[PDB]
């Protein structure tokens, strides 16, 4: 009858009611999720964001990569990080490049977990500009990130793709057809999914100098194309074609299509089209 | 005729000669390795250690995991980190546990790369006690780590195992028989290998309250056994049997034996036995 007990008890001696007052669901998949600023968070993700907002101090030099919960981010982390550092750490430095020395999930911090398990971590001690990547949805960014001039890179994956993500946990740690109902309803780890996509979409169309929307499927189909387009969203000059090829070349060392059945796909397909009808965002 | 150029140019405007004065090798596998305090480092690893020593401030509360270059450390990182945090983040917290929210290579920092690519990073901002894990060999520890009371966990893998590690790079980025000659000679990324093992061995036998030596092969054979032994090297009380089982159980979601031929194995086998003859350390 009490939220779970996770870390830094101290900062929880005066902050533990807000959490215990939000709507929560249930089932067996996840324990006690809570609805915060419009979305349902696992208790873990929520305690983080909660300070992740109270403390994060953006810098116009930052660059936030936004992705969905549980889908791999390696390549998305290794990729760009390699793009920015082409002179600091030449893409030709092979074994000396940060990607051949340090795991990509230490080089590009997930605030959420940084603030979750290490609430005192000092991001101001990392080098600027900064590269990191998060799960949050628009309307929950650190005041500066919103009122600052960094650069947003939103990396979207088809829901049916993001769905399998959350599903995995339910496989590792009410069949799949049930979990889909929840996903499509929106009271599911990370949803209602059609908003953990549409505001960064309309966010990109509205203020294209701060927010960029890239589909993970196109990032894969034409990697060199999308990268040329990403580097032109937060840079200041020209980028050779061979520059982009040298980067992807370096990063080469880093689904539903086989998990859902036609009906559950169509089911999500029916909600995609609907939720995304008229918005301009069409899913392949 | 100049070492490569890697990051923070600033701190390299007065420090760049030391590097350019150490012995170096060659071949094609690696570019320009340098011998520092007895060992050969890739240029990257060396620039790190170099400040990693000038700056790191140990805390008797720390805990350093020492491992060899390139061999996977996930499970070794996920494992212990889970052991210490059994109350801060209950092993039963499943999806809320730091291991189901943050990649294990961000939770347990590799100083080397932290100091390499982020020289200003403030480790004093992480929570204590601290968990991190490094590649260095004994005689290169931060003054405090040596003159402090933290706790060393050295995780050794058979050389022929560590060898394949360094070899991999030569596969991704002079056949294998040649690389073995270098490994066995010692002027190879990380060697002379029989010392990136024997001082933490005699280090453990000499001061068993600070340095522990665990073979990765036993860590695998009897995971619950070794863990009970690790937790008793840097703790202060009793640990249930089911405690250890709950931890490994949680971490379950996280070679040469097929790469070397009998002759090259025996070749390294001939050097193991020799280098390790009389020392007490015998390899299976």
Curated annotation (Swiss-Prot), chains A, B:
It is an enzyme of class 2 (transferase). SUPFAM superfamilies: P-loop containing nucleoside triphosphate hydrolases (SSF52540). GO terms for molecular function: brassinosteroid sulfotransferase activity; flavonoid sulfotransferase activity; sulfotransferase activity. It comes from the Eukaryota. Keywords: Cytoplasm, Transferase. The active site is at 135 (proton acceptor). It is found in: Cytoplasm. 3'-phosphoadenylyl sulfate binds at residues 70-75, 157, 165, 216. Induction: Up-regulated by pathogens, methyljasmonate, salicylic acid, salt, osmotic stress, cold, auxin, cytokinin and abscisic acid treatments. Not induced by desiccation and ethylene treatment. Expressed in the aerial parts of seedlings, in roots, leaves and flowers. Not detected in stems and siliques. Its EC number is 2.8.2.-. The keyword Iron does not apply. Pfam families: Sulfotransfer_1. InterPro entries: P-loop_NTPase, Sulfotransferase_dom. Disruption phenotype: Hypersensitivity to NaCl and ABA in seed germination, and to salicylic acid (SA) in seedling growth. Belongs to the sulfotransferase 1 family. Dimer. Sulfotransferase that utilizes 3'-phospho-5'-adenylyl sulfate (PAPS) as sulfonate donor to catalyze the stereospecific sulfate conjugation of 24-epibrassinosteroids. Preferred substrates are 24-epicathasterone and 6-deoxo-24-epicathasterone. Low activity with 22-deoxy-24-epiteasterone. No activity with 24-epimers catasterone and brassinolide. Sulfonates salicylic acid. May be involved in detoxification. Enhances plant response to pathogen infection and contributes to long distance signaling in systemic acquired resistance (SAR). This is Cytosolic sulfotransferase 12. It comes from Arabidopsis thaliana (Mouse-ear cress). The lineage of its organism: Eukaryota, Viridiplantae, Streptophyta, Embryophyta, Tracheophyta. The gene is SOT12.
């Amino acid at each position: 009858s009490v939220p779970a007990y996770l870390g830094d008890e101290d900062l929880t001696q005066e902050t533990r009611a807000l959490i215990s007052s939000l709507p929560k669901e249930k089932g067996w998949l996840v324990s006690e999720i809570y609805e915060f600023q419009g979305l349902w968070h696992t208790q873990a993700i929520l305690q983080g964001i909660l300070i992740c907002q109270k403390r994060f101090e953006a810098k116009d030099s930052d660059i936030i990569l936004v992705t969905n919960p549980k889908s791999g981010t390696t390549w998305l982390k290794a990729l760009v990080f390699a793009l920015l550092n082409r002179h600091k750490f030449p893409v030709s430095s092979s074994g000396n490049h940060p990607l051949l020395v340090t795991n990509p999930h230490l080089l590009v911090p997930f605030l959420e977990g940084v603030y979750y398990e290490s609430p005192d971590f000092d991001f101001s001690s990392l080098p600027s500009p900064r590269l990191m990547n998060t799960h949050i949805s628009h309307l929950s960014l650190p005041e500066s990130v919103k009122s600052s001039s960094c650069k947003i890179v939103y990396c979207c994956r088809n829901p049916k793709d993001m769905f399998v993500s959350l599903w995995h946990f339910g496989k590792k740690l009410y069949p799949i057809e049930k979990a889909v109902e929840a996903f499509c309803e929106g009271k599911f780890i990370g949803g209602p999914f059609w908003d953990h996509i549409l505001e960064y979409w309309y966010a990109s169309r509205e203020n294209p100098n701060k927010v960029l929307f890239v589909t993970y499927e196109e990032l894969k189909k034409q990697t060199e194309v999308e990268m040329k387009r990403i580097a032109e969203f937060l840079e200041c000059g020209f980028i050779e074609e061979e520059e982009v090829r040298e980067i992807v070349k370096l990063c080469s060392f880093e689904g539903w299509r086989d998990t859902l059945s036609e009906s559950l796909a169509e089911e999500i397909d029916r909600t995609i089209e609907e939720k995304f009808k008229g918005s301009g965002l069409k899913f392949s």
